[PDB]
Design a protein around this ligand. Structure first.
Ligand SMILES: Nc1ncnc2c1ncn2[C@@H]1O[C@H](COP(=O)(O)OP(=O)(O)O)[C@@H](O)[C@H]1O
Ligand SMILES: Nc1ncnc2c1ncn2[C@@H]1O[C@H](COP(=O)(O)OP(=O)(O)O)[C@@H](O)[C@H]1O
Ligand SMILES: [Mg+2]
Ligand SMILES: [Mg+2]
Lengths: 371, 51, 51, 183
């Protein structure tokens, strides 16, 4: 039979059968209970709208993501999300399909063990396998080397790989991602008068960020230009009218990636954690990693980031090496495409964690040889 | 509606066409860049040999 | 639909912008093909000088 | 038929058919197992890269020479090196070719005996002969006398020869060589 390549993610759940080009169903991972009282009788009001249904009734819900930073903080809601994904968005019972979840690097063990225990006890799948979210993004590019920066919505991690041999001592995981950029944008919009507070209006700020923000090639020059002319002010229409005008908030929101001091984080930007991740590698594979830097994940879709990052790394790196940044147009679904490719391989067909194996060793089987 | 129907269909076809074009052209640009870089490495080899 | 009308118009505009990048990628492809041919020739002459 | 003139050395294995001017295949004698874990499936990753292949993937290997100072300290790796030399760098089966190994002076007997036992049992050559590395270097100069200082990479030895009669009591073998200079 065919395998189910699910990809929990944090912000958008992407799923679909193995062997295709794009995920079959992509929908936000939010579960929102209603918060008001409700007076109409017999309206058929449910107790929790999940997935894309709660992005249409969000006016009277309190949306809450079940995955904070890679890790899962609310297991009941995550189980609900998985149940919805299997039964309503794909309509395939899990009793007859292997599953291939994905997990960020350096995550707590208990999260992974609970994930496998749920998949084997509640949904009762035949066999499931958990894979690191960066190796798949490297599969999708058709490479076999390279250092991949997978800046998702929950957590940004940077896994270097050479000739198929991952370097476990050079993984640099940073917890700044799209959600913190949404919060920072929502916080700097208040400087013009627009106040978004409700958990429903966070979605509106996210839409503003997606449609308007861009990464500046040079920050100081853009700050000077936006403060003199008015060629940058782009307007946007809220879900009820009252258009708003975003000035130099456009390139200040995604600039947080390269200067995490804006949101008070100490660490260095995504332009310098990649160079540090490279320098921890051996001295003889640094040229190949320099030449095959891969971008993935949703947050790396800002217009103009593949040039800013290349300029920064070229500034840091030695002058002789060639710096090349692979930015495929299908960046958002890169991890899932790689997952489909991996699940479609014949050599991989014996790596699944078969159910009888789980019955013999318990949920701690995932840390064992079947990784 | 019928007017909207035709508009929608035509815009969708145009969008898919543009996407396919730009994707294939991206593959082409990848290939030509590979040509350039591999040729450059040949250049370096030749330079070392001559010197 | 009016919103579907605006969406189809925006998507067709996006298609046209992708076609403008299609033109730019075509220019990149052509110039890099010139580079490939020039590199073939220069590598041939370098190897000959090596001989 | 033609003879195989192999020359184990320590640092570079030089081999080729007898009667030519230069060795056919010269490549470092290192065997390096990978040391990291490896996540790509089906990449076709081998368990040991030998010869010149391990000088290109050396970023993720742990290269280790199988010959320390003339003597051979790791017989399995040396057998692997010989197998590679015969089958992939020369592509001639050893069942149909005599071999002429070379050995430093004043080396342990067991090393030489094990070398001949391997060549006769595993590779199954028709006939092999072991020669002292300095007499050959005296052949190449076209002389018949002279004192030759053969400062290899493993061991430096100094064999004096007169009129073809070697003087066994005047061989001065010193274990400083290229490897110690590298260190
Ligand atoms: N076109 C876009 N431009 C800018 N940011 C985007 C775009 N699309 C998505 N994002 C950001 O990326 C996030 C989605 O990232 P995604 O790759 O789905 O995360 P995950 O790894 O959990 O799947 C969204 O929250 C959004 O903030
Ligand atoms: N051109 C050179 N200049 C200086 N040292 C060299 C040069 N070529 C080789 N060497 C040294 O000599 C060693 C190779 O010696 P070689 O004669 O191959 O040893 P063997 O007797 O084992 O074959 C190398 O390890 C290197 O350190
Ligand atoms: Mg992701
Ligand atoms: Mg020698």
């Amino acid at each position: 039979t065919t395998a189910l390549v699910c990809d929990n993610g944090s912000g958008l759940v992407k799923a679909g059968f193995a062997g295709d080009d794009a995920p079959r169903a992509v929908f936000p991972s939010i579960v929102g209970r209603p918060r008001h009282q409700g007076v109409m009788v017999g309206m058929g009001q449910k107790d929790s709208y999940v997935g894309d249904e709660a992005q249409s009734k969000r006016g009277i819900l309190t949306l809450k993501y079940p995955i904070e930073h890679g890790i899962i903080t609310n297991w009941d809601d995550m189980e609900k999300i998985w149940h919805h994904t299997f039964y309503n968005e794909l309509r395939v019972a899990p009793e007859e399909h292997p599953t291939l979840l994905t997990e960020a690097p350096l995550n707590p063990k208990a999260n992974r063990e609970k994930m496998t225990q749920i998949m084997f006890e509640t949904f009762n799948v035949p066999a499931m396998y958990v894979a690191i979210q960066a190796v798949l993004s490297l599969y999708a590019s058709g490479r076999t080397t390279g250092i991949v920066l997978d800046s998702g919505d929950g957590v940004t991690h940077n896994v270097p790989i050479y000739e198929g041999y991952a370097l476990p001592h050079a993984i640099m995981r940073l917890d700044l991602a799209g959600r913190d950029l949404t919060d920072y944008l929502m916080k700097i919009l208040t400087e013009r008068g627009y106040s978004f507070v409700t958990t429903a209006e966070r979605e509106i700020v996210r839409d503003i960020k997606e449609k308007l923000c861009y990464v500046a090639l040079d920050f100081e020059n853009e700050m000077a230009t936006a403060a003199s002319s008015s060629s940058l002010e782009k307007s946007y229409e809220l879900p009820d009218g009252q258009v708003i005008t975003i000035g130099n908030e456009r390139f200040r929101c995604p600039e947080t990636l390269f200067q995490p001091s804006f949101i008070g984080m100490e660490s260095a930007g995504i332009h310098e954690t990649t160079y540090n991740s490279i320098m921890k590698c051996d001295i003889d594979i640094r040229k190949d990693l320099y030449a095959n830097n891969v971008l993935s994940g949703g947050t790396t879709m800002y217009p103009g980031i593949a040039d800013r990052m290349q300029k920064e790394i070229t500034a840091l790196a030695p002058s002789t090496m060639k710096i090349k940044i692979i930015a495929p147009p299908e960046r958002k679904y890169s991890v899932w495409i790689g997952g489909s490719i991996l699940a479609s391989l014949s050599t991989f067909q014996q790596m699944w964690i078969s159910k009888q194996e789980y019955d013999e060793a318990g949920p701690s089987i995932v840390h064992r040889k079947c990784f | 509606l019928k007017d909207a129907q035709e508009k929608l269909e035509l815009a969708e076809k145009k969008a898919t066409d543009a996407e396919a074009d730009v994707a294939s052209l991206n593959r082409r640009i990848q290939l030509v860049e590979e040509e350039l870089d591999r040729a450059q490495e040949r250049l370096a080899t030749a330079l070392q040999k001559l010197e």
